[PDB]
């Protein structure tokens, strides 16, 4: 009877820092997923402040099968483009901003592609 998957992430966020801080931007993702074999992907994109948007990081759980038991069981690769710093963190669901300059301020989006479908995405405006 069940078919598909559902996610929930509280789209709109607002984080304010100051130069030289060590904050960590974290999302609290909620999910209920069936049909175990999927391709989860958690992608952090960035836009300075607006139409264009850069790419900052992306974690991929490729061909995982842990459906309802905590998906951190199976681990995936977390290759991040080094044009930024931004030490990535657990499950790929949170960034860590180490020794931040002002230039990192901007609108960050965290889009979750589940099996090629954008199942949720949340905005967070980081500014001084």
């Amino acid at each position, epitope marked *: 009877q069940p078919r598909g998957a559902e996610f*929930h992430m*509280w789209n*709109y*966020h*607002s*984080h304010v820092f100051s130069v030289g801080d060590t904050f960590s931007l974290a999302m609290h993702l*909620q999910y*209920k997923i069936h049909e175990a074999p999927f391709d989860l992907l958690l992608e952090w994109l960035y836009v300075p402040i607006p139409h264009l948007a850069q790419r900052v990081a992306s974690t991929v759980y490729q061909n995982c099968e842990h459906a309802d038991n905590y998906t951190a069981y199976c681990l995936g690769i977390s290759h991040m483009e080094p044009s930024f710093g931004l030490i990535l963190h657990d499950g790929g669901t949170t960034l860590k901003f180490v020794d931040t300059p002002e230039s990192l301020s901007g609108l960050y989006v965290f889009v979750v592609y589940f099996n090629g479908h954008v199942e949720a995405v949340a905005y*967070t405006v980081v500014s001084t």
Partner: antibody
Amino acid sequence: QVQLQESGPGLVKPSETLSLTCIVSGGSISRYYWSWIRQPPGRGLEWIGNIYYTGTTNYNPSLQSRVTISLDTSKNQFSLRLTSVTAADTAVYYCARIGGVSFGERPIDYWGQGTLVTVSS
Amino acid sequence: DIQMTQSPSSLSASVGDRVTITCRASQTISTYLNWYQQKPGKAPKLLIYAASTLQSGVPSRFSGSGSGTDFTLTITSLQPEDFAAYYCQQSYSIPLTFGGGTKVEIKG
């Protein structure tokens, strides 16, 4: 089992800053959202904002231009700041918790006592 | 801003009667709303979460149901202790928004 207490002044002159502070006890700031809700003297209640354990504040955009929420994990508390208070901001202010770990669970389960903030001169 | 419409806004029922209130949303909020009860002078208590689940320590005469954009709270047998007001609140999308509220007065 956790309990929360508001510590704000009950009278604020118009156009000034309303500053409240909610102290939590009997529990942690661990992984929940910590929220503020207003209720006018006879009207229904409206959500003003909540804050996570690493900044990441969610504000009601109706008055996002005037409000800020700060965290004091070191002292296990969190404060609400509302600038340029008009006569319409007279309401009862509750501090509460939004939590739950499941799909359909994001409830305001544990509420505070609520303090009355009347604004006049 | 999701608009939440609550029905009715004021009702009077005798003791033991079956009370039913409806909550409607402008957008589909998947099993995402909570029913709260506010007694006069006191702070709201969580009655129902997940739109169908009972909070610990609440009598079983409170029953939540519905999904999509239509939800229903049912008090099976009214008691003289349930004079409070009742609200339905969504948590699907920021900003979180409450309902108008229903004044349940006891006519028994």
